[PDB]
Design a protein around this motif. Structure first.
Motif, PDB file in Angstrom:
ATOM      1  N   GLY A 241       0.809  -1.208   0.000  1.00  0.00           N
ATOM      2  CA  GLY A 241       0.000   0.000   0.000  1.00  0.00           C
ATOM      3  C   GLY A 241       0.843   1.259   0.000  1.00  0.00           C
ATOM      4  O   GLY A 241       1.824   1.344   0.741  1.00  0.00           O
ATOM      5  N   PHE A 242       0.472   2.249  -0.810  1.00  0.00           N
ATOM      6  CA  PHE A 242       1.291   3.430  -1.044  1.00  0.00           C
ATOM      7  C   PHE A 242       0.467   4.697  -0.893  1.00  0.00           C
ATOM      8  O   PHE A 242      -0.718   4.718  -1.236  1.00  0.00           O
ATOM      9  CB  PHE A 242       1.894   3.398  -2.438  1.00  0.00           C
ATOM     10  CG  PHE A 242       3.019   4.362  -2.631  1.00  0.00           C
ATOM     11  CD1 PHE A 242       4.129   4.319  -1.813  1.00  0.00           C
ATOM     12  CD2 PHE A 242       2.973   5.301  -3.641  1.00  0.00           C
ATOM     13  CE1 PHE A 242       5.166   5.199  -1.991  1.00  0.00           C
ATOM     14  CE2 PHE A 242       4.009   6.182  -3.824  1.00  0.00           C
ATOM     15  CZ  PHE A 242       5.108   6.129  -2.999  1.00  0.00           C
ATOM     16  N   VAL A 243       1.103   5.756  -0.400  1.00  0.00           N
ATOM     17  CA  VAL A 243       0.468   7.065  -0.248  1.00  0.00           C
ATOM     18  C   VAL A 243       1.484   8.166  -0.535  1.00  0.00           C
ATOM     19  O   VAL A 243       2.321   8.472   0.324  1.00  0.00           O
ATOM     20  CB  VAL A 243      -0.135   7.236   1.157  1.00  0.00           C
ATOM     21  CG1 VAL A 243      -0.489   8.678   1.412  1.00  0.00           C
ATOM     22  CG2 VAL A 243      -1.377   6.396   1.314  1.00  0.00           C
ATOM     23  N   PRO A 244       1.470   8.773  -1.718  1.00  0.00           N
ATOM     24  CA  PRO A 244       2.346   9.920  -1.971  1.00  0.00           C
ATOM     25  C   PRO A 244       1.715  11.228  -1.521  1.00  0.00           C
ATOM     26  O   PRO A 244       0.508  11.435  -1.648  1.00  0.00           O
ATOM     27  CB  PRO A 244       2.517   9.891  -3.489  1.00  0.00           C
ATOM     28  CG  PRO A 244       1.250   9.309  -3.973  1.00  0.00           C
ATOM     29  CD  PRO A 244       0.815   8.305  -2.947  1.00  0.00           C
TER      30      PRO A 244
ATOM     31  N   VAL B   6       3.793  -0.416  -6.848  1.00  0.00           N
ATOM     32  CA  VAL B   6       2.525  -0.176  -6.181  1.00  0.00           C
ATOM     33  C   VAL B   6       1.747   0.906  -6.918  1.00  0.00           C
ATOM     34  O   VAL B   6       2.293   1.697  -7.694  1.00  0.00           O
ATOM     35  CB  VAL B   6       2.745   0.209  -4.713  1.00  0.00           C
ATOM     36  CG1 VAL B   6       3.284  -0.962  -3.949  1.00  0.00           C
ATOM     37  CG2 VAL B   6       3.715   1.354  -4.637  1.00  0.00           C
ATOM     38  N   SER B   7       0.447   0.935  -6.671  1.00  0.00           N
ATOM     39  CA  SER B   7      -0.430   1.954  -7.216  1.00  0.00           C
ATOM     40  C   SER B   7      -0.760   2.963  -6.128  1.00  0.00           C
ATOM     41  O   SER B   7      -0.955   2.589  -4.968  1.00  0.00           O
ATOM     42  CB  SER B   7      -1.707   1.327  -7.768  1.00  0.00           C
ATOM     43  OG  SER B   7      -2.471   0.752  -6.729  1.00  0.00           O
ATOM     44  N   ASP B   8      -0.799   4.243  -6.494  1.00  0.00           N
ATOM     45  CA  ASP B   8      -1.082   5.278  -5.508  1.00  0.00           C
ATOM     46  C   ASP B   8      -2.481   5.095  -4.943  1.00  0.00           C
ATOM     47  O   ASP B   8      -3.439   4.849  -5.677  1.00  0.00           O
ATOM     48  CB  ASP B   8      -0.944   6.666  -6.121  1.00  0.00           C
ATOM     49  CG  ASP B   8      -1.734   6.813  -7.382  1.00  0.00           C
ATOM     50  OD1 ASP B   8      -2.157   5.776  -7.931  1.00  0.00           O
ATOM     51  OD2 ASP B   8      -1.949   7.962  -7.819  1.00  0.00           O
ATOM     52  N   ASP B   9      -2.594   5.220  -3.630  1.00  0.00           N
ATOM     53  CA  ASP B   9      -3.817   4.875  -2.927  1.00  0.00           C
ATOM     54  C   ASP B   9      -4.241   5.997  -1.999  1.00  0.00           C
ATOM     55  O   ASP B   9      -4.832   5.760  -0.944  1.00  0.00           O
ATOM     56  CB  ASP B   9      -3.633   3.579  -2.150  1.00  0.00           C
ATOM     57  CG  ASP B   9      -3.254   2.423  -3.041  1.00  0.00           C
ATOM     58  OD1 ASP B   9      -3.734   2.375  -4.192  1.00  0.00           O
ATOM     59  OD2 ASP B   9      -2.467   1.564  -2.599  1.00  0.00           O
ATOM     60  N   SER B  10      -3.953   7.233  -2.373  1.00  0.00           N
ATOM     61  CA  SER B  10      -4.313   8.364  -1.530  1.00  0.00           C
ATOM     62  C   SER B  10      -5.827   8.486  -1.465  1.00  0.00           C
ATOM     63  O   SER B  10      -6.473   8.619  -2.511  1.00  0.00           O
ATOM     64  CB  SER B  10      -3.701   9.648  -2.070  1.00  0.00           C
ATOM     65  OG  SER B  10      -4.289  10.008  -3.306  1.00  0.00           O
TER      66      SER B  10
ATOM     67  N   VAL C  85      -7.737   3.292   3.095  1.00  0.00           N
ATOM     68  CA  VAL C  85      -6.788   3.199   1.994  1.00  0.00           C
ATOM     69  C   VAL C  85      -6.788   1.771   1.474  1.00  0.00           C
ATOM     70  O   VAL C  85      -6.885   0.815   2.252  1.00  0.00           O
ATOM     71  CB  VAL C  85      -5.378   3.644   2.429  1.00  0.00           C
ATOM     72  CG1 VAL C  85      -4.948   2.879   3.633  1.00  0.00           C
ATOM     73  CG2 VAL C  85      -4.390   3.434   1.318  1.00  0.00           C
ATOM     74  N   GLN C  86      -6.707   1.630   0.158  1.00  0.00           N
ATOM     75  CA  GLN C  86      -6.814   0.332  -0.488  1.00  0.00           C
ATOM     76  C   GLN C  86      -5.465  -0.373  -0.474  1.00  0.00           C
ATOM     77  O   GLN C  86      -4.436   0.243  -0.758  1.00  0.00           O
ATOM     78  CB  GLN C  86      -7.316   0.505  -1.917  1.00  0.00           C
ATOM     79  CG  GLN C  86      -7.846  -0.755  -2.549  1.00  0.00           C
ATOM     80  CD  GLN C  86      -8.914  -1.419  -1.712  1.00  0.00           C
ATOM     81  OE1 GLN C  86      -8.619  -2.136  -0.756  1.00  0.00           O
ATOM     82  NE2 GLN C  86     -10.168  -1.167  -2.056  1.00  0.00           N
ATOM     83  N   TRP C  87      -5.469  -1.658  -0.134  1.00  0.00           N
ATOM     84  CA  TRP C  87      -4.272  -2.476  -0.218  1.00  0.00           C
ATOM     85  C   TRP C  87      -4.379  -3.431  -1.405  1.00  0.00           C
ATOM     86  O   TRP C  87      -5.412  -3.522  -2.068  1.00  0.00           O
ATOM     87  CB  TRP C  87      -4.056  -3.224   1.089  1.00  0.00           C
ATOM     88  CG  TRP C  87      -3.587  -2.345   2.182  1.00  0.00           C
ATOM     89  CD1 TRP C  87      -4.173  -1.199   2.614  1.00  0.00           C
ATOM     90  CD2 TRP C  87      -2.431  -2.534   2.996  1.00  0.00           C
ATOM     91  NE1 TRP C  87      -3.454  -0.657   3.645  1.00  0.00           N
ATOM     92  CE2 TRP C  87      -2.376  -1.461   3.899  1.00  0.00           C
ATOM     93  CE3 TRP C  87      -1.435  -3.506   3.050  1.00  0.00           C
ATOM     94  CZ2 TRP C  87      -1.375  -1.338   4.842  1.00  0.00           C
ATOM     95  CZ3 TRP C  87      -0.439  -3.376   3.984  1.00  0.00           C
ATOM     96  CH2 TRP C  87      -0.417  -2.305   4.869  1.00  0.00           C
ATOM     97  N   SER C  88      -3.298  -4.156  -1.682  1.00  0.00           N
ATOM     98  CA  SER C  88      -3.281  -5.073  -2.814  1.00  0.00           C
ATOM     99  C   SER C  88      -2.344  -6.227  -2.501  1.00  0.00           C
ATOM    100  O   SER C  88      -1.450  -6.109  -1.662  1.00  0.00           O
ATOM    101  CB  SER C  88      -2.835  -4.368  -4.100  1.00  0.00           C
ATOM    102  OG  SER C  88      -3.621  -3.222  -4.366  1.00  0.00           O
TER     103      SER C  88
END
Lengths: 49, 49
Positions: free
Chosen positions: A36-39, B17-21, B6-9
């Protein structure tokens, strides 16, 4: 490791026994990962609360 | 202020990873006014008890 029991039998006098060798099995558990990522901008970190 | 989690994968090795803001919302509640009115006559205000 997984297995079972041994199969007996009710026999008579002077009689051969039956081959009762049990069998096995190996259960397998692979291990996986999640992410999981958050920029965030620099301005947001120092402005938002 | 409201938002969501927030979405996890589940990702394989060496996978970006894909941005999950999460997105955010602004609930707002306006304040309104109610009124009432009743007139009375001078003779009425003098006579009735």
């Amino acid at each position: 490791v997984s297995s079972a029991a041994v199969q007996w039998s009710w026999d008579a006098e002077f009689e051969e026994v039956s081959d009762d060798s049990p069998e096995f099995g190996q259960p397998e558990i692979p291990v996986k990962k999640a992410q999981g990522f958050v920029p965030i901008s620099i301005e947001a970190l120092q402005d938002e609360a």
